[model samples]
Each structure stands twice: as structure tokens, then as C-alpha cells.
Target: MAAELEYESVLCVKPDVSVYRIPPRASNRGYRASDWKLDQPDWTGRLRITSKGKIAYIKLEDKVSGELFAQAPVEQYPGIAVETVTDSSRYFVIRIQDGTGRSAFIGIGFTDRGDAFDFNVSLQDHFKWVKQE
Candidate 1:
């Protein structure tokens, strides 16, 4: 008898882990990294000009224009050292840091159903997914 060998194709995947700096618990909540670390960079690149009384967020879905993560007031979270600004003057990636979290999606118009693709990229198209299901 002869021994049999088997081979299978394998794909590589990166891990999703990082440190997030939040404002205590009073300021922000629900976002934490398993890896555990702290970093502050334009606070994830999402701006809400809380001073201007303007709100920021990502729309959940188009059904009724639901909200994803409604932008928190540009105030200190007291939860972690979280805060925001409303100047709308500046804004701005990454292997070391995987974020710019998930932004809102908005599409208003009518088009014939003709074009379709499997792969999609956000308008920003900045980061890649480390985990998939």
C-alpha cells in the first residue's frame, strides 16, 4: 500500500486588534480593542464641530434614514478623554491603526439596475478588513 498526501489552498488573514483612547465612561462607551492600547489621532478622523451645535453620524440605512453611530457631542466624554471640535476646517490611515471606523452611506437618486460588482470600497477606501465571516 502507498501513503496518500493531501494539499489544500490557504488564504492569509490579518488580525483586528488595537488600542483606543476613550473619555472615561461618562464621555464615550462601547468601543474597545481586545489587544488594548491607547492612541489619539484626530480622534479617528470623524469631526462634528460640537461647538457649532452641528451633529455628525453615519446613517444606518436608507429605509428611514436611520443612524449608525450618531456622532457624540464635541464634548469631553469624561469616559476616556474623548472630545470633539466643530470648525469643519481640517480633517484627514493604515496597517499600524485600523480605523476611520465605519462611516455613513447616503445615496439619493434613481438608476436602472444594470451594473453590479462583488467587491466594494468605501468612498474613502482607506483600510482593509482583517477578519471575515
Candidate 2:
């Protein structure tokens, strides 16, 4: 049988926002219970798989419902940037831009990739966050 799926415990998204993400959810990335996130009308959160973890990527989920929300993949398209070392969470954070081109960040990389964290290394491979317009 396939190994039982694992998730980082359901979490709530902050109010004033409908979206959130938790990375390293395996390549499947979201919704362990069911594939379709909503009841109908078919809306899907964004997703990305990158060269960062033990099968890495950021998973978007509704903070309240913990359903799928949006995605930004570092190792994939719309890629990675080394978050400033000053904020020492020991996780990977990346730049994510919405449709209009304004952007910000969401951290996913859980490992403290200290010496390996480099800015020029971002877009070259697996890894990549967000902001507003």
C-alpha cells in the first residue's frame, strides 16, 4: 500500500485574507482527504513543486477551512529567492507575484540552509513567495 499521507496539522489563515500556504506537503501538496477543494464552480489554489525539500513545494490553503488556497513553487516556474538571513526561521521563503506583477513572500523551506542560501541560486532550480499590487 502507499504510505499514509502526512500533513503539518491544519492551520488557520489570518483574517482579511482567504489564502495561506504550508510547504513540504509532498508533491501532492494539498487536500489529503479529497482532491477537489470546494463544493462546486471549480476554483483551484495555485501550486508549485521545487528543489528544496524531501519533495518540496508551497501549498495554498484556506486558513479557516484549511482548504486549498494558492501556490508559489520555487524550483518550478515563478521561482525562488533567498530570503534575508536576518530573519532566522531556518525555512525557505520566496517571492510570489500575483497577476498584476506586484509581489511579496511566504516561507516554505524548513531546513536552515545556512551556507547554501544564495540569491543567484534562486531561479536556477527548485525553490521560489508573494505581495500585493
Candidate 3:
């Protein structure tokens, strides 16, 4: 028999926005009323792996405040996502979009492995909020 999977919980917060904390392994990151850029799209909130190395689902929360820094949407700014691959030095993808619907992508590198892992954001002008629980 295969061992059970292990999942981690995460709370993703943008720079001056409310904090969204999800419990389940997977959920959609819904659009918030305070979304300024209007770039909200339903996406997988959290990603996890079971003890036997299977992907798990977790909830995603919207932590944006009803404030506008720019006319761009929050998702168009710089969003974050987390994943656990088999290799510690594997490359990960970061997807970004502009207000006009233009999309860009970048690759990231992982430096550690196991339950607790860390990687550098592939973008040069943005940051990510990742915590291990």
C-alpha cells in the first residue's frame, strides 16, 4: 500500500491588502470587491503533495484591500504560486500578465528540498510570499 499524502497550508498576502488564509489543499483565488486592476481570474489557490508524492489541493484567499495604486489589476501586477517537484534543482514557471492582456513567463530555480523548500522568484521586479507550515 502507498503512504498517505502530506499537505501544507499557506496564507498569501499582497503588499497592503487584507490577509487571505485557506485551509483546504485546493481552492480558487476569487476576485475581490476591492480589486483595482480588475484582472481577477479564478485560479488554483494552493498546491501541495501527499506523503507518497501526489499532488493535493488547498484553498486560496483574496487579501486585497479596496485601494488603487495603479489602474492595473492585481493579477496583472505580480502573482505567486508554489509547487514541489521531484528534483531540488528543477526549474519552475512564473506566469505574469499586463493590463492589456499581454502575458510573460519566467523560470525559477529551487535551492532546497523536502517538506521545507525555497526558490528564488524568476522575475526581476516582483517578489513572492511563501511560507512553510
Identify the leading candidate in terms of TM-score: 2
Task: Order the candidates by TM-score, highest first.
Answer: 2, 3, 1
- TM-score against native, each model: 0.17, 0.27, 0.23
Decoy 2 TM-score against native: 0.27
- Model 1 misplacement above 4 A: 1-45, 53-67, 74-133
Model 3 ranges with Cα > 4 A deviation: 1-89, 114-116, 119-133
Error of 3 at 86 (Å): 10
**Tens-place lDDT digits, model 3, residues 41-105:** 32322222111122222222333423323221233233344332333333333333434354432
Q: Is candidate 1 or candidate 3 better by lDDT?
A: 3
lDDT for position 25 in model 1: 34
lDDT of each prediction vs. the true structure?
Answer: 0.22, 0.34, 0.28
Root-mean-square deviation of each candidate, in angstroms? 20.1, 16.7, 16.3
Cα misplacement distance, residue 91 of candidate 2 (Å): 2.4
Q: Write the per-residue lDDT of candidate 2 for residues 25-122, one digit (tens) a residue.
A: 33432223222122222232323233343223445544345463555433223433334334343334445543334344433332235422432243
Query: Per-residue lDDT for 105 in model 2?
Result: 40
Query: Residue 110's C-alpha lDDT in candidate 2?
Result: 21
